[PDB]
Amino acid sequence: QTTLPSGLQIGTGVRPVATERLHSQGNLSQTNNSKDVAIKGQGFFQ
């Protein structure tokens, strides 16, 4: 009555799709310079 479905399905393999960057917030280290700036939050210079 109840048996296994008896079906075949062969895989092929694995491929890399993407590399996501963790755009988190990094720590701030003091360089004591007067012409260095750091971003707090989001945003990029141009």
Partner: protein
């Protein structure tokens, strides 16, 4: 009849072929499971018997 030798040898060859086929089938189904209708697979053997026509050939009654 000096010609029943061929019959005896042919029966022996057929019996040996049957036994080899059974052994090969068992080896193929060594690690099988859940055959038709779900009943588990079970191994089988053959039994040789002589045809008392005295001296006679070999036969396999059933598996």
């Amino acid at each position: 009849a000096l010609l029943n030798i061929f019959d005896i040898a042919g029966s022996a060859l057929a019996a040996q072929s049957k036994r080899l086929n059974v052994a090969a089938s068992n080896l193929a189904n060594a690690d099988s499971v859940t055959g038709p209708d779900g009943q588990p697979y079970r191994a089988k053997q053959v039994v040789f018997q002589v045809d008392a026509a005295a001296t006679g050939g070999v036969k396999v009654a059933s598996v």
